[PDB]
Amino acid sequence: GAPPPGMFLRPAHSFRRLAGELKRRRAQSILDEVARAQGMLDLFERQ
Amino acid sequence: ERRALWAEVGPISDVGSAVTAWIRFGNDPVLHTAVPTMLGGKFRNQQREKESLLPNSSSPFAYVEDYMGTNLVFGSPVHAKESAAVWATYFERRYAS
Amino acid sequence: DTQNDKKQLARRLGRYMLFANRSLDDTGFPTDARADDYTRWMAPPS
Amino acid sequence: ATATLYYATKPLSNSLDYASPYKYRRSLITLCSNYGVETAYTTQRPLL
Amino acid sequence: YPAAVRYGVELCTVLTAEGKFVDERGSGLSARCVVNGTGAAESVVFDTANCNGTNTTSVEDALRVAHGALRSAQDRHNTLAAFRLGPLSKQSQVLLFCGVNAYEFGGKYARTYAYAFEKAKKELEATAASGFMAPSLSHEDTERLSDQPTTSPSVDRFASTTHPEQRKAQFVPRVGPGSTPLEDPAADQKSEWS
Amino acid sequence: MLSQNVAKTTVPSYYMIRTNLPHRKPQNQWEGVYYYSGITKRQRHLILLHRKREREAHMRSFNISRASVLQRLEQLSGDRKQESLPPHVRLDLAVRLAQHGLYQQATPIVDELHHQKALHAGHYALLINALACPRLGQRILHCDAQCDPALTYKLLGDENGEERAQEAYRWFDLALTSLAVDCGHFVPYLPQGTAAASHITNALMRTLLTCGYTHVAAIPDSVYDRMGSMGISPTISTYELVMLALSLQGNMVEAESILSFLRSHHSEHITVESFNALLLGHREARQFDCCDAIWQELVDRRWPRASPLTAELYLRSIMDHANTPTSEPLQSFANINVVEKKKVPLVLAQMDELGVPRTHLSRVLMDEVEDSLRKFQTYRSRFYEWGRAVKQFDFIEFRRRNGWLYDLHLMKCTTKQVGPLRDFNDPDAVQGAVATAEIPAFFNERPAWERPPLEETLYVTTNKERYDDVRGGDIYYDDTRGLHDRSPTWMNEVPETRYDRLYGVNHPDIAKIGIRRHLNVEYVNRKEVVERDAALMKKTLSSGRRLRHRVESSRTHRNAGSLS
Amino acid sequence: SFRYTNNLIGALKHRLLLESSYREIASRKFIGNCRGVEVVCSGYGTVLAVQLTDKAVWESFYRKTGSLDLDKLAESIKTALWDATRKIRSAKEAALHRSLSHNTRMRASADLKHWYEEDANTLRPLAFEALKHEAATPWMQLVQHGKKEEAAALLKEFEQKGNREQPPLASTLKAEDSNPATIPIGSVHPLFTPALVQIEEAGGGSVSNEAVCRAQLWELSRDEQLFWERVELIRKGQVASIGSSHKRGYADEAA
Amino acid sequence: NDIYRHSFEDVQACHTQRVTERDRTMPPYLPTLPHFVAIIKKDPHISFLLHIGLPDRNSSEE
Amino acid sequence: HQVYLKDMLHLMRYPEPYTHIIDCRTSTQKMHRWVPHSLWLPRDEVEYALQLSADEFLDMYGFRKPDKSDDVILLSHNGIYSEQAGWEWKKQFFQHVYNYRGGTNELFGESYSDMNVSDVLSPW
Amino acid sequence: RASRTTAEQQREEERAQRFGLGRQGALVQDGGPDQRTLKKHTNDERIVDAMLFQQNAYRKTPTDEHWNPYIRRSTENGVGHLLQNKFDIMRREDRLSKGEQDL
């Protein structure tokens, strides 16, 4: 992505960055699923 | 100056002395090798169930690199080129200015 | 009665120091401060 | 590393471009960035 | 870091583990135990249910059984602690080992630590020699001037050696209670009493 | 040089001849004679060094005797071997070990003796008494506790006090079992009734004193109650141990009660050690008037005979008293409580009337006492000579070389006068001074909220005399400058700096002229970061709303519009 | 001046004494007893033996023809164990107390908190750590307590040649290792062990002058160069902004 | 903080003030629930009541 | 308060983290060596330097500004400029400020002087 | 992240207004950088720091002046320097719990 103001991008294929990106992939899948699940609750709750 | 001179090797030289060191840090051969590891909340412990680029090992010591994300020792060839490039650029700018 | 039983062991412990009248500060340890000071710090709201 | 930089940056030598001030600067900076990288390696080595 | 280590220690101290043992010699005598992080036993219980009505088990064998149960319990507790405190302690190891240069025992300050270390040892020795009453901090106790270290408070750092008005700490001359001289105390004003 | 060295005489003139102004100060009646009580740096150092060496001597002795006992143990364990030593040898070994505080090694020996029924009545009392470590007690008393008897109990408690306590209780029960065996009319109360039982109980108490606070507190509570319950009759040393316990706790009411009961019923049996107990106690509770009352009483009844320990406790209590401060209200002139030390040469005199040898007093206490003496005691000899002017002025010279002239009479010139207070009852009435006194400035000084904040630190003040002739008004003024004061021309008076082109600029960008931005390769400027994030929290309030689209309410269903 | 070195020496005196204490308590027996029942623990709190002293006396207390209580018996075992453990804890705290009362530098900072910040829970030996220290081989125990000499020795002899009453550590830890003089710097402050291990010699327990001087000399080199870089820039800034390399003196350099 | 990093010389600077055990490190006693649970279970009377004093937790209903 | 040569050598071999040794030498022309672990604030700048914020000071001198609790040892050729600088550091209120007199001359065996002042007074 | 940073910066500005921290007017004034003015009962950076200076100037430890007996047993800062052996500490605990005075 685009860095926070005072920061610099670590290299790709660096352990710290690989871990970080992994963390982001997982977190964002979770947030997506949750969003949709709450949507479904809305759908059968007849919002 | 006379007392010091140069060092060829770091604090822990060989796999033997590493085993000794590792025990001394308060680690137990059976128990502290048997605790599962976490990769981002996943519990990576399921083995070869997933494909990612990251060394497969229990010890956090396997994942150590510099603060700059660089490893010029024991890094994968990609990591090694990437990191020598990082430092090359940095020093190029330094000695330029 | 019988040597080193429950009751004897209990009476060896002495008087029980009440947790109410204990003066413990923020770190959970008894205070450095003078009793009059500590008392004032912990006094009820008004 | 130091001796490499020493010999290479010695007065007129094959590792410096005397053609133009720009080319000169580039040759020198290339050698210094080289030295620098060897130094960083040397820094990480004992610990890593 | 040291806060987190402490946290681990207190948590394990307070938590509880449980263990079982059944007699190998054939009476169905079995014991259960519940055990703190202290090694102490919160509970010990024998179960006569499994074993037959004949009984006839000597006190010795009940003791052996309870022994075994306390064992398995303390072991369960040790293993659980290894798993509770394990990951954080391993990463702690990387922090301290490779992150030395953040600390006061790393780099240029390592040499100071080692120095302090040796002094402490040597100092312990003399305390043991002096009857476990420590020598003076001020090193007023010493035979030779060569002996008092450069680190001692005895060493006189004042603008002037001779001139009294130049011997203050702050801009004017502070006084102790009762308008007694503070700055440079006279021999009898310093009292070491109980 | 020294700024308290100040003209006491006026410029020589005929005004000294033609006027009745006095040429010297009148003598100050309440200023004491200056005399010499005080020691050198060198002397204090000599005392400390010497003291340290005696400490070492004692610690050396203890190490030798301990090493000896331990060698006797290893020798009796290994060399005697298969052949069993007679019981008395083992028993002696156990006792000697426990006395040096190795209880751990004495435990198995004692166990094995009790199992063979080699111990009888007094032997148990012997062991239990040995658990109080009084060869270790000696060492602690001399080195660590600095010869104070109360501290020695407290510190002894820190040597494995809990385990020694537990052992003492255990051996005590062992003992009661053995006694009941040995007694086998009074069959029912035969074990408790026997003197041996009382002896043993005392041993138990005498040891528990030496363990921690907890156990000391347990003597007058549980042990004594259990002794009453059990049916064991006490001896005078039982009561004195209970008093010593109560008094280490600082419980004076109860200690004194026990002594009262004794006085009333058992008086002929009272030893000195109850007075010792009470003295130690009152000193702990820091009640020094009681500490005094009990000593004076003990001098009146001259029996029981005071012991060097008694005299030591009383004297210590006096030094303690003398070194306590009062609160700030009483601290303005001096430290009052020093007067207590002046009791000392009276107490010493009593110690001679009583036959208490003054040379059994700890080295420590005798240093403090000798000091106390050199403050207030002097002989009729010295007294005839102590006012000579040579000695008074020599004392002044000493004070001058240490730069403290402030208090001395001859040597101080007061300058500042304190004006009168106006009345709104009249501006007209002209006040005039009936009398004049020199009194410290802290009586009336401008109230702290009226005067500028910390004056000593932020202002350099000097009181000085005008050189020019002053027609009227005061001949002294206060020259006060600020600590931070500088020439208004300062910037010219100093070499040029790289700062100068910032002249008269309220918010310079020091980031720009600074060297860090060239030195660093990356160079994050901390002030652009925060700008960027405030710029980002501006965008959260820049939200517009998109137009929503209402549908038509119906009672029976919901209407579904679709994009068309 | 020298606040840091002095406070440090104080703190390390404290550490050495707590460590020496740990090594005393670790190899040692503690006996709890309740009614005829002797529970025997190591310093690590691990139950070694459960015995009945004087079967003659105590056996009929539990009955036996009578059937066993197992309730009375359980309570007395429990109680005995508790007693033993409480002895251990008290020993630890005792060590702490002796240390605090004799250590004058720590007394200098006036802290009631010194007395409560380490207590039985906190000090070593820790009970939940018993296993890894006790179950260990003699070699492993040697290296754990930082004796590299005897561990190497034992290792070479290992290669070339290829209810009991005693705490398992009384083998490896003997009397002489209670001397705070002997304690290696790696072992002194366990919290930091992995960092303090690098100050230490490769084979010997004692600190290596060479390693520590190497470490210092490296940083000194770096920091020297930094110093001159900054001096260079500050000077160039001076000359730039002032316009010349000259400066005025001070008003007092006329005389 | 894994993907992005601070300027190199900012951490160079940061390693100029070392972490010191005594002052510059947070104290080993922070408020934490087990710290207090430990403190109030460390009292001799309550430790006695827990282990020995009360009738056994597994044995009986009381 | 003074700091003697002994203290100086000791602090060379055994540095303290929060003790700062600050070089006050004014002219770059006269300074050829580096007192170990020192930092450079020339005397001429001090009055300004000490009134910068932590950040600004970092930007101008390239090292962290000592906190007011920390030990500050001052350094010069003779010990004169270090003294004057000391007065500056003391006037902003810095609690431990030590001047090492005889400083760089004693350390390195150089004979230089911060100011040219002579003992002789010109006849009145 | 922006929220954290903004709140940080705002706390610093507030603290600056409370104690009057920060330089006054222009740093490069003719009469020196130093120049400052104090108004009656008003906090200022200079006053804060002079105040601390007074407290600990060359002070090595809080126990520095305890060579002096009358300073040593002052109870003003608390009782903590007067508790030396465990015994005494426990005694204090006990007596305090019973609701009596500390010795």
GROMACS .gro file of C-alpha atoms in nm, chain F residues 89-225:
model
  137
  521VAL     CA    1   2.888  -3.731   7.226
  522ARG     CA    2   2.608  -3.701   6.970
  523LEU     CA    3   2.402  -3.485   7.207
  524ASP     CA    4   2.693  -3.247   7.260
  525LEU     CA    5   2.749  -3.231   6.885
  526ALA     CA    6   2.381  -3.151   6.819
  527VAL     CA    7   2.383  -2.875   7.077
  528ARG     CA    8   2.706  -2.723   6.945
  529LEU     CA    9   2.577  -2.729   6.585
  530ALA     CA   10   2.244  -2.570   6.672
  531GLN     CA   11   2.422  -2.300   6.871
  532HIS     CA   12   2.604  -2.182   6.555
  533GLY     CA   13   2.277  -2.181   6.371
  534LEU     CA   14   2.318  -2.503   6.182
  535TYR     CA   15   1.988  -2.650   6.284
  536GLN     CA   16   1.958  -2.843   5.961
  537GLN     CA   17   2.247  -3.064   6.059
  538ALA     CA   18   2.133  -3.100   6.420
  539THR     CA   19   1.782  -3.219   6.325
  540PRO     CA   20   1.868  -3.575   6.209
  541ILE     CA   21   2.097  -3.626   6.512
  542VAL     CA   22   1.823  -3.524   6.755
  543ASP     CA   23   1.570  -3.745   6.576
  544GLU     CA   24   1.794  -4.045   6.604
  545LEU     CA   25   1.855  -3.972   6.976
  546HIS     CA   26   1.485  -3.942   7.058
  547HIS     CA   27   1.418  -4.267   6.873
  548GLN     CA   28   1.673  -4.452   7.092
  549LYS     CA   29   1.529  -4.291   7.407
  550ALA     CA   30   1.873  -4.151   7.492
  551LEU     CA   31   1.726  -3.817   7.597
  552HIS     CA   32   1.576  -3.741   7.938
  553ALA     CA   33   1.420  -3.439   8.108
  554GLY     CA   34   1.681  -3.165   8.097
  555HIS     CA   35   1.841  -3.279   7.772
  556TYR     CA   36   1.540  -3.165   7.573
  557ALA     CA   37   1.552  -2.825   7.743
  558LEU     CA   38   1.918  -2.817   7.647
  559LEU     CA   39   1.843  -2.874   7.278
  560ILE     CA   40   1.547  -2.642   7.255
  561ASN     CA   41   1.758  -2.371   7.420
  562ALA     CA   42   2.034  -2.437   7.168
  563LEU     CA   43   1.793  -2.364   6.883
  564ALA     CA   44   1.811  -1.995   6.974
  565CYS     CA   45   2.159  -1.986   6.817
  566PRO     CA   46   2.334  -1.802   7.082
  567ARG     CA   47   2.681  -1.828   6.929
  568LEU     CA   48   2.528  -1.673   6.623
  569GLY     CA   49   2.353  -1.430   6.848
  570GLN     CA   50   2.693  -1.320   6.976
  571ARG     CA   51   2.824  -1.255   6.626
  572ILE     CA   52   2.508  -1.068   6.522
  573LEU     CA   53   2.506  -0.864   6.838
  574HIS     CA   54   2.859  -0.742   6.784
  575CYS     CA   55   2.881  -0.692   6.406
  576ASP     CA   56   2.530  -0.632   6.258
  577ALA     CA   57   2.315  -0.505   6.541
  578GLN     CA   58   2.590  -0.269   6.655
  579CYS     CA   59   2.566  -0.399   7.009
  580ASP     CA   60   2.200  -0.314   7.057
  581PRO     CA   61   2.025  -0.607   7.237
  582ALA     CA   62   1.677  -0.542   7.085
  583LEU     CA   63   1.799  -0.530   6.729
  584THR     CA   64   1.974  -0.861   6.790
  585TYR     CA   65   1.642  -1.038   6.846
  586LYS     CA   66   1.492  -0.873   6.540
  587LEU     CA   67   1.786  -0.966   6.315
  588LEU     CA   68   1.817  -1.317   6.451
  589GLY     CA   69   1.464  -1.363   6.326
  590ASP     CA   70   1.596  -1.341   5.971
  591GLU     CA   71   1.818  -1.644   6.003
  592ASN     CA   72   1.577  -1.914   5.897
  593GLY     CA   73   1.350  -1.807   6.182
  594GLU     CA   74   1.049  -2.002   6.058
  595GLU     CA   75   1.226  -2.333   6.036
  596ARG     CA   76   1.393  -2.297   6.373
  597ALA     CA   77   1.050  -2.214   6.519
  598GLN     CA   78   0.892  -2.520   6.362
  599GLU     CA   79   1.174  -2.734   6.494
  600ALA     CA   80   1.137  -2.589   6.841
  601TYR     CA   81   0.766  -2.673   6.851
  602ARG     CA   82   0.837  -3.025   6.725
  603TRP     CA   83   1.112  -3.097   6.979
  604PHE     CA   84   0.891  -2.952   7.252
  605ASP     CA   85   0.626  -3.212   7.173
  606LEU     CA   86   0.890  -3.485   7.160
  607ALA     CA   87   0.994  -3.368   7.503
  608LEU     CA   88   0.642  -3.382   7.652
  609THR     CA   89   0.608  -3.738   7.525
  610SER     CA   90   0.941  -3.841   7.678
  611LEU     CA   91   0.844  -3.678   8.010
  612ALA     CA   92   0.514  -3.863   8.029
  613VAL     CA   93   0.715  -4.184   7.975
  614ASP     CA   94   0.966  -4.100   8.253
  615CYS     CA   95   0.699  -4.020   8.511
  616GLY     CA   96   0.551  -4.367   8.461
  617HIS     CA   97   0.028  -4.012   9.325
  618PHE     CA   98  -0.076  -3.725   9.088
  619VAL     CA   99  -0.100  -3.969   8.792
  620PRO     CA  100  -0.337  -3.733   8.596
  621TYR     CA  101  -0.134  -3.408   8.642
  622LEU     CA  102   0.201  -3.590   8.694
  623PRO     CA  103   0.358  -3.480   8.358
  624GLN     CA  104   0.236  -3.113   8.369
  625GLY     CA  105   0.292  -3.086   8.748
  626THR     CA  106   0.665  -3.180   8.727
  627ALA     CA  107   0.922  -2.894   8.734
  628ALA     CA  108   1.080  -3.046   8.422
  629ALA     CA  109   0.769  -2.958   8.222
  630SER     CA  110   0.795  -2.596   8.330
  631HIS     CA  111   1.165  -2.588   8.243
  632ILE     CA  112   1.097  -2.720   7.893
  633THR     CA  113   0.813  -2.474   7.828
  634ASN     CA  114   1.045  -2.190   7.923
  635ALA     CA  115   1.305  -2.323   7.678
  636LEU     CA  116   1.044  -2.316   7.401
  637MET     CA  117   0.954  -1.952   7.471
  638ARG     CA  118   1.318  -1.841   7.509
  639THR     CA  119   1.379  -1.980   7.161
  640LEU     CA  120   1.067  -1.841   6.996
  641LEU     CA  121   1.189  -1.490   7.088
  642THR     CA  122   1.471  -1.542   6.842
  643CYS     CA  123   1.252  -1.621   6.540
  644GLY     CA  124   1.048  -1.368   6.344
  645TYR     CA  125   0.778  -1.119   6.446
  646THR     CA  126   0.503  -1.376   6.409
  647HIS     CA  127   0.643  -1.607   6.672
  648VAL     CA  128   0.744  -1.337   6.916
  649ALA     CA  129   0.381  -1.225   6.895
  650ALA     CA  130   0.273  -1.584   6.956
  651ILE     CA  131   0.449  -1.618   7.293
  652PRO     CA  132   0.219  -1.401   7.513
  653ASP     CA  133  -0.085  -1.517   7.317
  654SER     CA  134  -0.091  -1.887   7.230
  655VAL     CA  135   0.211  -2.044   7.408
  656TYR     CA  136   0.117  -1.886   7.740
  657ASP     CA  137  -0.248  -1.972   7.697
   0.00000   0.00000   0.00000
